Write a protein that binds this ligand. Structure first.
Ligand SMILES: Cc1ncc(COP(=O)(O)O)c(CN[C@@H](CO)C(=O)O)c1O
Ligand SMILES: Cc1ncc(COP(=O)(O)O)c(CN[C@@H](CO)C(=O)O)c1O
Lengths: 394, 394
């Protein structure tokens, strides 16, 4: 029945208002492969709103590995990994990820989102604590809500606040600190050296979400612990396959005893169907390309350094990025929606960040680089951004 | 750091003990396509532990639709549907599901699990209520924990307990009842006529999880509301693609205003990468086969009726199934593990249900049918089960 349900959704008017004003630019229906240019409404649009940092979703080798796994294994496994949904190729990918991030063992999940739900829901229980950076990804907040532990947020990269909040907790309790590695909003890196120093002093477990770090920082792209030399001080390395690795799924890697506990206790792996064969094979062949062909990471950072220097030279107000995510502050929700749509209508795709996710005065667009971008495409996007920011009077 | 974390996992000894006793049969590594026979350790094993009710993960048409979508769209969309991860083919699949289940609109999710997280996390809030059948799938319990509402369980298919618990709640609050359609443990069907009668009297919203119902019950497999004629009395129809539809992902269908709210407010769709192109295309072509070729549903039910009658004729103690899930009670955790491994070692794959998920005296194996099973394969599995149950002295 719908009376009360209709009242619950009655106040949600922003989408209706964006559509009516001709500003709506969510769920834009792309008609072609994710690439540096995409087709939308039959026209070609420069893609600066992707997470495909290495441009690998179009690599013919990765496509053919996926098509070959469909031929051999079919369209799906039709069960959880726990029961009838494990393939030899899942186990292979776990072994190859464990080697890549320097851990004993790993467990796959069908999404990156579920990869955070698993360890955060089942390791800390009644009378324990989870400590979260306040800017952690939604999946980490949600995984923490699924625990029976007390969840405590600390100020963004605020090591004194983390240390003070830990200090206060009962000694006779377990604690787990979970942080993004690269934070996607502003593209900043966690202070892993200080965080791990604090964790060691309070015997707290450390879990890093390397969604935006794998294929981006660390030796041969191995992530945030690799970037800082702190493999031994991070208990759990989580990553996703939906970004540099051009696929869908994720994993958690760590000590074999912890991973054995997770794979038999995490509801998001016991009660959800396994990764498709095609995604296991695409992730495996992306992982072998990222390591064997250093040119992809190198070109990503050439593009990042070039675009960042060009945006600063034009006087754009950038956030504190240390990644291929270039956050461009606008500081008005209305202007952020207008700039986003004006750019779309001039063939440039960027992602808006608005209220209620952030305060109006912190609203921005996110301009992300791919290894496969050209300097010409970067130049075209930035000269269109200059024109739209003028038209908008930012 | 690992001291307290090592203490948290220290008491989890069942896996170690199963492995040491040679009884371990989780994460069995299959080397071939999910089918009526699978390869494990190089040998052929009859598969009676699948959710692929129509056997479609091996259909060459579905494989080629998936391979063709890889060719056109690549290995992944590298973003949430909300931003850069929508394709024209996602929108097509939403329209074709909305038509199939008789609703205005649908939103896809990358997993079935996330499809329950979305509506259960974001529709009922502070001062509202979610009412859950106590046997609801883990994803429904978890999605309810992510809400800010008060979650109330009611006794399994206990309409007097549902009615009494609703009765007691403040009139000036929203309520949402969420139930499995087919419950996978025992394969029983929700009392949707009485549940919807109660929901109408208390103006509670109704959400049905048709994971095990789509492709199984309802006209041309359209699910539990279709099975009872109660499309108008169910607000939200949720389903998965990982079972009859041979793929990965899921959806929620309903009124366009509710679906528009969900797709812009459900964290599991705003903050998780979209379905791979290959899975959208496999789901689309499975959906067209289920409707156009009635032989698949018909053969599933021939196999189900034949196996059920054969198990009852041999004197197995079956649960109250109304589906192709045949629960065979053993009522001893030790015997359930032994029977499971003895069957595996004789080339028969079934799924155990044990403590702590159920009480020892309710432990069982689940024997599920596929349309593609033959009566010969059913006969071989049941004659092996008879032999193992004797050897085990059940
Ligand atoms: C009623 C119901 N609702 C939701 C889901 C989650 O769907 P997914 O496995 O496609 O994520 C399942 C999963 N069921 C399987 C995994 O596919 C299990 O082993 O639990 C389910 O049975
Ligand atoms: C830090 C971090 N951790 C986890 C995830 C979830 O991974 P998934 O998108 O592969 O499920 C994301 C997703 N990030 C994208 C979707 O891919 C977003 O729009 O939110 C993430 O940024």
């Amino acid at each position: 029945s719908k009376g009360k349900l209709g009242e619950k959704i009655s106040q949600f008017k922003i989408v209706e208002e964006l559509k009516a004003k001709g500003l709506y630019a969510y769920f834009r229906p792309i008609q072609s492969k994710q690439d540096t240019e995409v087709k939308i409404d039959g026209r070609r649009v420069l893609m600066f709103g992707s997470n495909s940092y290495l441009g690998l979703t179009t690599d013919t080798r990765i496509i053919k590995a996926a098509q070959d796994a469909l031929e051999k294994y079919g369209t799906g496994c039709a069960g959880s990994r726990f029961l009838n949904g494990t393939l030899d190729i899942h186990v292979e990918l776990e072994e190859k990820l464990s080697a890549y991030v320097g851990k004993e063992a790993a467990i796959l999940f069908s999404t990156g989102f579920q990869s955070n739900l698993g360890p955060l829901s089942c390791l800390m229980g009644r009378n324990d604590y989870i400590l979260l950076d306040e800017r952690d990804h939604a999946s980490i907040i949600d995984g923490s809500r699924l625990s029976f532990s007390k969840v405590i947020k600390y100020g963004h990269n605020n090591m004194e606040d983390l240390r003070a909040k830990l200090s206060r907790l009962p000694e006779d309790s377990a604690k787990l600190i979970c942080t993004d590695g690269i934070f996607s909003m502003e593209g900043d890196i966690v202070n892993l050296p200080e965080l791990t120093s604090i964790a060691n002093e309070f015997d707290a477990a450390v879990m890093v979400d390397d969604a935006h770090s794998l294929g981006v920082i660390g030796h041969k792209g191995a992530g945030t612990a690799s970037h800082f030399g702190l493999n031994d001080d991070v208990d759990l390395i989580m990553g996703t396959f939906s970004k540099s690795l051009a696929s869908l799924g994720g994993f958690v890697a760590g000590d074999a005893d912890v991973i054995d506990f997770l794979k038999h206790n995490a509801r998001s792996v016991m009660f959800s169907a396994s990764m498709t064969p095609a995604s296991v094979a695409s992730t495996l062949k992306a992982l072998e390309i990222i390591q064997n062909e250093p040119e992809h990471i190198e070109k990503l950072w050439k593009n990042t350094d070039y675009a960042k220097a060009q945006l600063l030279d034009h006087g754009f107000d950038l956030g504190a990025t240390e990644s291929p995510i270039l956050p461009i502050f606008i500081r008005s929700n209305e202007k952020t929606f207008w700039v986003t749509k004006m750019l779309q209508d001039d063939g440039v795709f960027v992602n808006p960040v608005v209220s209620p996710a952030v305060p109006a005065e912190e609203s921005l667009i996110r301009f992300s680089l791919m290894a496969t971008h050209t300097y010409d495409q970067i130049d075209e996007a930035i000269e269109k951004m200059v024109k739209v920011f003028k038209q908008a009077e930012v």
